[PDB]
Swiss-Prot record:
Originating species: Saccharomyces cerevisiae (strain ATCC 204508 / S288c)
Misc. comment: Present with 1620 molecules/cell in log phase SD medium.
Disulfide pattern: none
Name of the gene this protein is made from: CHD1
Residues of the full protein shown: 574 to 653 of 1468
Purpose of the protein: ATP-dependent chromatin-remodeling factor which functions as substrate recognition component of the transcription regulatory histone acetylation (HAT) complexes SAGA and SLIK. It recognizes H3K4me. SAGA is involved in RNA polymerase II-dependent transcriptional regulation of approximately 10% of yeast genes. At the promoters, SAGA is required for recruitment of the basal transcription machinery.
Family according to the record: Belongs to the SNF2/RAD54 helicase family.
Domain remark text: The 2 chromodomains are involved in the binding to the histone H3 methyllysine at position 4 (H3K4me3).
Record localization: Nucleus
Subunit note: Component of the 1.8 MDa SAGA complex, which consists of at least of TRA1, CHD1, SPT7, TAF5, ADA3, SGF73, SPT20/ADA5, SPT8, TAF12, TAF6, HFI1/ADA1, UBP8, GCN5, ADA2, SPT3, SGF29, TAF10, TAF9, SGF11 and SUS1. TAF5, TAF6, TAF9, TAF19, TAF12 and ADA1 seem to be present in 2 copies. SAGA is built of 5 distinct domains with specialized functions. Domain I (containing TRA1) probably represents the activator interaction surface.
Effect of inactivating the gene: Decreased sensitivity to the cytotoxic effects of 6-azauracil.
Protein name: Chromo domain-containing protein 1
Domain of life: Eukaryota
DNA sequence: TATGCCCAGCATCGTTAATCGATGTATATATCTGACACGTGCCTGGAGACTAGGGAGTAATCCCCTTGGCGGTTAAAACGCGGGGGACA
């Protein structure tokens, strides 16, 4: 928490938490097992996509088509 | 003397014209009532003007409450089948 008490803080947290804790990496049985890997994907927007990336953040053509439902999903659509 | 013949005589029918009166239609006049606008008079309940103060506006922060997402059971909704008893004539 505190910037300069943090050492004081983990002096209390590291010494106490460990017992009832176990931290151990794979570095085991993974030597046989074939390798792990992950790739990201940058996909840019489409045609009908912007329409509903742009119009949805307002109630322009989101209210023209399915306007009755617009109301409940309006926040649903925003950040979730 | 009785019976056909001459000379009036009012009522029968119809038609013309003047007259009192009823009906229909204007036409300018004298009431009837029902006013709505104005001036008469007066009251003050509003308008007009100024003040003083505290409500309410707004802005800045907080933190609680409302919405959300998710997944497990476990009751509830859903369905149908069947036949009885209430609706309806």
């Amino acid at each position: 928490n505190q910037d300069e008490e943090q050492e004081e803080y983990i002096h209390d947290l590291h010494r106490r938490i460990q017992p009832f804790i176990l931290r151990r990496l794979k570095k085991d049985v993974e030597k046989s097992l074939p390798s792990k890997t992950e790739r990201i994907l940058r996909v840019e927007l489409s045609d009908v996509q912007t329409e509903y990336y742009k119009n949805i953040l307002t109630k322009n053509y989101s209210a023209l088509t399915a306007g009755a439902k617009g109301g409940h999903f309006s926040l649903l659509n925003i950040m979730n």
